[PDB]
Write a protein that holds these residues in place. Structure first.
Motif, PDB file in Angstrom:
ATOM      1  N   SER A   1       0.830  -1.193   0.000  1.00 22.77           N
ATOM      2  CA  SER A   1       0.000   0.000   0.000  1.00 22.77           C
ATOM      3  C   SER A   1       0.868   1.249   0.000  1.00 22.77           C
ATOM      4  CB  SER A   1      -0.913   0.018   1.227  1.00 22.77           C
ATOM      5  OG  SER A   1      -1.562   1.275   1.357  1.00 22.77           O
ATOM      6  N   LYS A   2       0.435   2.262  -0.742  1.00 27.48           N
ATOM      7  CA  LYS A   2       1.132   3.541  -0.769  1.00 27.48           C
ATOM      8  C   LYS A   2       1.025   4.248   0.579  1.00 27.48           C
ATOM      9  CE  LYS A   2       0.882   4.514  -5.722  1.00 27.48           C
ATOM     10  NZ  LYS A   2       0.218   5.304  -6.793  1.00 27.48           N
ATOM     11  N   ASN A   3       0.125   3.772   1.436  1.00 32.02           N
ATOM     12  CA  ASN A   3      -0.030   4.349   2.769  1.00 32.02           C
ATOM     13  C   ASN A   3       1.001   3.767   3.730  1.00 32.02           C
ATOM     14  OD1 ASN A   3      -3.021   4.210   1.517  1.00 32.02           O
ATOM     15  ND2 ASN A   3      -2.864   6.006   2.847  1.00 32.02           N
ATOM     16  N   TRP A   4       1.697   2.730   3.282  1.00 32.48           N
ATOM     17  CA  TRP A   4       2.715   2.084   4.101  1.00 32.48           C
ATOM     18  C   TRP A   4       4.085   2.676   3.810  1.00 32.48           C
ATOM     19  CZ3 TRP A   4       1.385  -3.825   3.214  1.00 32.48           C
ATOM     20  CH2 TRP A   4       0.093  -4.068   3.692  1.00 32.48           C
ATOM     21  N   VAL A   5       4.177   3.411   2.719  1.00 34.39           N
ATOM     22  CA  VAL A   5       5.438   4.003   2.288  1.00 34.39           C
ATOM     23  C   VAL A   5       5.917   5.052   3.282  1.00 34.39           C
ATOM     24  CG1 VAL A   5       6.604   5.272   0.434  1.00 34.39           C
ATOM     25  CG2 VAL A   5       4.828   3.603  -0.119  1.00 34.39           C
ATOM     26  N   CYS A   6       7.096   4.810   3.851  1.00 33.82           N
ATOM     27  CA  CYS A   6       7.712   5.732   4.805  1.00 33.82           C
ATOM     28  C   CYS A   6       6.834   5.885   6.046  1.00 33.82           C
ATOM     29  CB  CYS A   6       7.974   7.092   4.148  1.00 33.82           C
ATOM     30  SG  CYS A   6       8.898   8.271   5.192  1.00 33.82           S
ATOM     31  N   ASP A   7       6.458   4.758   6.624  1.00 32.12           N
ATOM     32  CA  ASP A   7       5.654   4.754   7.841  1.00 32.12           C
ATOM     33  C   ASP A   7       6.494   4.245   9.012  1.00 32.12           C
ATOM     34  OD1 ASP A   7       5.632   1.918   7.184  1.00 32.12           O
ATOM     35  OD2 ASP A   7       3.867   1.723   8.456  1.00 32.12           O
ATOM     36  N   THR A   8       7.810   4.419   8.873  1.00 29.84           N
ATOM     37  CA  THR A   8       8.815   4.035   9.877  1.00 29.84           C
ATOM     38  C   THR A   8       8.805   2.534  10.172  1.00 29.84           C
ATOM     39  OG1 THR A   8       7.449   4.632  11.849  1.00 29.84           O
ATOM     40  CG2 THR A   8       8.894   6.331  10.934  1.00 29.84           C
TER      41      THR A   8
ATOM     42  N   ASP B   1      13.201  -5.103   2.235  1.00 31.40           N
ATOM     43  CA  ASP B   1      14.441  -4.386   1.965  1.00 31.40           C
ATOM     44  C   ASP B   1      14.324  -2.941   2.439  1.00 31.40           C
ATOM     45  OD1 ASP B   1      12.676  -3.403  -0.064  1.00 31.40           O
ATOM     46  OD2 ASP B   1      14.369  -2.988  -1.388  1.00 31.40           O
ATOM     47  N   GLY B   2      13.088  -2.515   2.671  1.00 31.99           N
ATOM     48  CA  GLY B   2      12.840  -1.193   3.205  1.00 31.99           C
ATOM     49  C   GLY B   2      12.892  -0.123   2.143  1.00 31.99           C
ATOM     50  N   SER B   3      12.674  -0.514   0.895  1.00 32.41           N
ATOM     51  CA  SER B   3      12.713   0.429  -0.209  1.00 32.41           C
ATOM     52  C   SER B   3      11.574   1.442  -0.117  1.00 32.41           C
ATOM     53  CB  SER B   3      12.681  -0.313  -1.542  1.00 32.41           C
ATOM     54  OG  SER B   3      11.740  -1.375  -1.522  1.00 32.41           O
TER      55      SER B   3
ATOM     56  N   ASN C   1      12.684   5.486   0.040  1.00 32.21           N
ATOM     57  CA  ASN C   1      12.127   6.487  -0.853  1.00 32.21           C
ATOM     58  C   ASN C   1      11.257   7.450  -0.056  1.00 32.21           C
ATOM     59  OD1 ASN C   1      11.219   7.912  -3.142  1.00 32.21           O
ATOM     60  ND2 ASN C   1       9.563   6.448  -3.501  1.00 32.21           N
ATOM     61  N   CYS C   2      11.914   8.339   0.669  1.00 28.44           N
ATOM     62  CA  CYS C   2      11.241   9.283   1.535  1.00 28.44           C
ATOM     63  C   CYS C   2      12.245  10.318   2.024  1.00 28.44           C
ATOM     64  CB  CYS C   2      10.609   8.543   2.714  1.00 28.44           C
ATOM     65  SG  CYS C   2       9.665   9.597   3.861  1.00 28.44           S
ATOM     66  N   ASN C   3      11.790  11.542   2.226  1.00 29.51           N
ATOM     67  CA  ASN C   3      12.675  12.617   2.656  1.00 29.51           C
ATOM     68  C   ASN C   3      12.278  13.155   4.032  1.00 29.51           C
ATOM     69  OD1 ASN C   3      10.318  13.689   1.357  1.00 29.51           O
ATOM     70  ND2 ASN C   3      11.334  15.657   1.039  1.00 29.51           N
ATOM     71  N   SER C   4      12.775  12.506   5.071  1.00 30.33           N
ATOM     72  CA  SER C   4      12.557  12.959   6.436  1.00 30.33           C
ATOM     73  C   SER C   4      13.729  12.551   7.321  1.00 30.33           C
ATOM     74  CB  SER C   4      11.238  12.400   6.981  1.00 30.33           C
ATOM     75  OG  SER C   4      11.025  11.065   6.550  1.00 30.33           O
ATOM     76  N   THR C   5      14.030  13.372   8.317  1.00 32.04           N
ATOM     77  CA  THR C   5      15.141  13.107   9.217  1.00 32.04           C
ATOM     78  C   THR C   5      14.689  12.312  10.442  1.00 32.04           C
ATOM     79  OG1 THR C   5      14.816  15.358  10.099  1.00 32.04           O
ATOM     80  CG2 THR C   5      16.618  15.027   8.522  1.00 32.04           C
ATOM     81  N   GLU C   6      13.895  11.271  10.213  1.00 34.40           N
ATOM     82  CA  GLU C   6      13.369  10.457  11.304  1.00 34.40           C
ATOM     83  C   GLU C   6      14.445   9.522  11.844  1.00 34.40           C
ATOM     84  OE1 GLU C   6      12.523   9.346   7.779  1.00 34.40           O
ATOM     85  OE2 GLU C   6      14.400   8.554   8.570  1.00 34.40           O
ATOM     86  N   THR C   7      15.523   9.403  11.074  1.00 34.47           N
ATOM     87  CA  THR C   7      16.641   8.534  11.399  1.00 34.47           C
ATOM     88  C   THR C   7      16.230   7.059  11.306  1.00 34.47           C
ATOM     89  OG1 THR C   7      17.352  10.281  12.940  1.00 34.47           O
ATOM     90  CG2 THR C   7      18.574   8.202  13.000  1.00 34.47           C
TER      91      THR C   7
END
Ligand code: CA
Length: 46
Positions: free
Chosen positions: A21-28, A34-36, A40-46
């Motif tokens: 799901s696109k809602n899962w993209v960059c949801d920490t 593989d965590g791709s 593919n995300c721009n945040s300093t969440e570390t």
């Protein structure tokens, strides 16, 4: 004439070619394994 992307319309295509799901993209939380979806995300969440 629109070009149909890989996976579902609402799905994201991971680097591993996984369809999540696109809602899962960059949801920490890596969904593609593989965590791709996280890479593919721009945040300093570390
Ligand atoms: Ca995720």
């Amino acid at each position: 004439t629109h070009a149909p992307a890989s996976c579902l319309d609402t799905q994201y295509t991971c680097d591993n070619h996984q369809c999540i799901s696109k809602n899962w993209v960059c949801d920490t939380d890596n969904d593609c394994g593989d965590g791709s979806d996280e890479k593919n995300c721009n945040s300093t969440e570390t």
